[PDB]
Amino acid sequence: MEIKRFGRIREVIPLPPLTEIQVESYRRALQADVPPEKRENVGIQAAFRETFPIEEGLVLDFLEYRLGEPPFPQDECREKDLTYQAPLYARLQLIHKDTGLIKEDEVFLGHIPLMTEDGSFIINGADRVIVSQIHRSPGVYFTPDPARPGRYIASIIPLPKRGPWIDLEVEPNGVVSMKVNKRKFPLVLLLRVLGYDQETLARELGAYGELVQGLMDESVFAMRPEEALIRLFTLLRPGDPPKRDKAVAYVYGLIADPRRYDLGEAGRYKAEEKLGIRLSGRTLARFEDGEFKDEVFLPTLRYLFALTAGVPGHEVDDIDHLGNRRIRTVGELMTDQFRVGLARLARGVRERMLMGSEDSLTPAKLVNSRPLEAAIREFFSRSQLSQFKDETNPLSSLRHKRRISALGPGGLTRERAGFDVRDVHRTHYGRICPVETPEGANIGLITSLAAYARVDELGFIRTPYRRVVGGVVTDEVVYMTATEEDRYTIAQANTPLEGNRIAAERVVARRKGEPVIVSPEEVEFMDVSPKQVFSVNTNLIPFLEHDDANRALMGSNMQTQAVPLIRAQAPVVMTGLEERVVRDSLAALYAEEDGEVAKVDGNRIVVRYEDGRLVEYPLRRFYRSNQGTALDQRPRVVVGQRVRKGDLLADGPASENGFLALGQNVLVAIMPFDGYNFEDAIVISEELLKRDFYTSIHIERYEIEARDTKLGPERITRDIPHLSEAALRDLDEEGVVRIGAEVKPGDILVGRTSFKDVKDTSLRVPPGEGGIVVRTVRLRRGDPGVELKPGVREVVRVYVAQKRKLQVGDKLANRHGNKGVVAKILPVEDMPHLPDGTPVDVILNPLGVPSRMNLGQILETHLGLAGYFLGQRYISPIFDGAKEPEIKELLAQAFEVYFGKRKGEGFGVDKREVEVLRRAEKLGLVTPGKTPEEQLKELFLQGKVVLYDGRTGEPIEGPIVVGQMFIMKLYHMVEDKMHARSTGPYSLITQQPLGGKAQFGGQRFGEMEVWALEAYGAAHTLQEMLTLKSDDIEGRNAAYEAIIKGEDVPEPSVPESFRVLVKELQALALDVQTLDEKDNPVDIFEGLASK
Amino acid sequence: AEPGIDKLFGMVDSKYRLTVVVAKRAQQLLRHGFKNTVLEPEERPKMQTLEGLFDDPNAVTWAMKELLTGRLVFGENLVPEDRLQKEMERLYP
Amino acid sequence: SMARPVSIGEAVGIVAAQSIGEPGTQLTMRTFHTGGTQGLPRVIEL
């Protein structure tokens, strides 16, 4: 199909690599391929250079590190449940301070997990993603005092877990007080420790008035800086003896030790730019010659006083400004955890150094590496930022890799986050998508990086702008932070141009986020593209400018949940971003160089490049994703085909010829239908099922283990007692089901016997599951690379696949936020059809449009009708694309085709068509006085056709909107949710039914359901729910026996949870006793607890 | 809606009393195997299956229909429960 | 709910609590439309 594209904005630069936020960050953190002599001082090299040298005499000094090659490949790690990692080696030197005896050694420090090419990790055989974290940048900030107007508070903030927050405030009495570790005390003593006299303070702060007079205190000043140090220590640590060296060490570690206090590089930059000073290091004060010298305290005092005095050029700080908020990527978080592990390693090394014969001490002997593995493994297995990777489709993984989270260790809490931190700031423009966020308790706390945004080395998000000089737009692109952006007037990207000169007297622009109208001379920068305002997911919604932001949010989120289909198609109307999305997800296969195709197979492609070098690409076939979807690559080339560089070789999942293909293009009519599309329900045709539309493949994995027990080992075998061969048919001679067998609920997958003289503990198909057995894996003890748990002899995995067709109860959605479950599947003869006999595939209720205000789907439907009759596809970029007149012209051509087809064959206008035209003439849709063909063309240009009812053959009394729509199947399928239970397992303590479908659990009858039952006055039903069905053990047993025997259920008794409550109240030394009508004790324990 | 639900609601001073009476009559019917009913065979509630028409197995339907017939007496302290139970066994083994 | 005198034994306290609480959960200051001492806080205060 021919592709026609709209839009006039020409983009100067392409999109950056969409996963570079992960890949580049981890590459910079590791620095694996850089020779050690030229390694920079960032990443784990910085951690090594900061932890070392170790001094306590003996000294341990770091020289270099190296990373070895991974012991196992990625596929082996996935199959054997290993972590894809590389060994880490450090070259160290043990040096005697006086002797100079050098002992050099290469030490194995352990393994560091390796990021794959697409930007994910393989941890214990599972794919994981580290989510970037947004937090307040370190530095010096000034905020208004909430209690007292006219007063300001200064704050110094280091990196998380790298020092205490320090507060400065001018008290009402005039004495400036600094809070650190929840201790108000005057700052003058610290100023005295830093070596400041009366004259120095008077000269440096004289201009600002009475604040310095109120700061002054002669009692502190008359003392020596040493006495001030001891006084400060005893004020900060009441009770601790005021030793000089102990106080020195404490104060040095509080604000002056680089190993404890650390303003980051971003914090240093922020402090330097705010205070207009140059910092020597990253700490608040320097320690030299047994003395403290200030670095930040005097500049922050000067800024605070000048702010309080209203001196021009000093402002307050916005806490949510994106120049004040930064992003920690995977590399920085991993480096922080590595630094913590290195601190533990150094502490242990010092402990071992202060012990043992100094002659027998070698570098290898001093280092115990275990805490390092503890830290890295805990980060990569237990951190909330380390998440089970979402791979329903390639777009799901791409979205997951670009997520920004305000939660996590050292972040916000879900339940107590206020509106301020969840609001779209004006600086989010071009850096954070204002649309894509999760609904619910996480709204505003998890967001997405904008399409063109890039996180800089300091952690600030930058966005690109074109430089304009003298009203002429140039091709120079500058990436700027929010602070730099605040200084200019930036024109909108849709500013009309002639050549590259601004051809408009009035230009819409932004100044510090305020929309303004300016002359072309005043313009300083221009936007690169509208695409840069929204994320990747939101950029895939055509006609986004006609959609309400809430439904755009819904559609952007729901595009991630789409399931790959065996006959997936790319949308008829695209935004022009699908090819880049599929390319950057690493799902498809592309030619590395120009060449010729040598071999094509269902699982293999051999390509002969011009250099005579043959390259073989295996194809990933029917692989179970984390969400159960099947991901396979299908060849798109033939033997002997000429391939250029970058040419597509194989399509990945949810891909059609290199375009993102999340669903199907279907013919839809917008009309009510017999109440079957009532309240967002959807009606579909059986003809969709006939051609395998919306058919997906899903794979489930079942695990069993044969282990060692004290009463005898368990054994996987075919020989099981007390079952006929009808239940033993498909298991092979090793007791494992054969490949190709169809399995139903209750069928055996793996046979197992356990000692009791043996009993059946086999693995069977759970209810509501099954399919075709496609894979079997057996792992035993001793095979290379296998690391089983102690006691476990062997493990068996069975992979079973199902081909799921569309059925009633499945969820479908379009890209504009319209979602609904299929409520009815009609036969083809009942569906509404066009006058040429073509039936529609989907019927959507028009009542979902007016209140949701997503008009993009209507325009998409009109363009889809035009494309359906013209046999072409369209590219409609967001905010710059197809408009109504162009759609009308395309529909005019489509109608000429659509009616010439009927006119050539010798057919006029139908009688039913004439009656519909008269009714529409009453409705004002067609102009009176024209021929029927003119009025039909009039209706067609509005996207409406005459439609016939399949049940009667009579037309629908009014013209109906009909056209092509792109609709995707969502993973929420009724097959995975339908669950029921009569009786089953119970909890250990409360003796109540378990929860969850996997556990065969029961539904929870919570507090509000009990309230509803009470409001109905249904005492007996509620008593049944409380006792006979949940935890009245004898009661439920008697009820089941009575029902099985045909009687009525007996009277209930006291639930076991009340007995548990009584026993737990007795454990708190409280005598809880149940009494009869005469206040005599009544024993609810039947005498089992009475001596 | 249940047939004659308005009549049943109007036959009692409290709707919960109607529920109690219906439940107790249903229990009485279930205990004696429908031998104590006040319905004559042509008014018996019927159920349709492949085999043919049979008696309706649901006792609540029987009790509600019987209450519609008006041949049942309900109230407070009509008969001691022990005597009622003994007589029910004696009349209907 | 029946347009008739209430029957003796009705749990009117639970009914009253639900009747007050239900509208507050959804319709009080449902999806708000961004287009050209109040609400629930005032009710909770009272």
Partner: peptide
């Protein structure tokens, strides 16, 4: 103690005409 669990209604008895009379015939003795 509400609805069918209320003391106002939960002690109600139900009996047919046949059983009611003979219980009196026992008391009439």
């Amino acid at each position: 103690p509400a609805g069918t669990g209320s003391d106002f209604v939960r002690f109600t008895q139900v009996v047919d005409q046949k059983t009611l009379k003979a219980i009196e015939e026992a008391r009439k003795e």
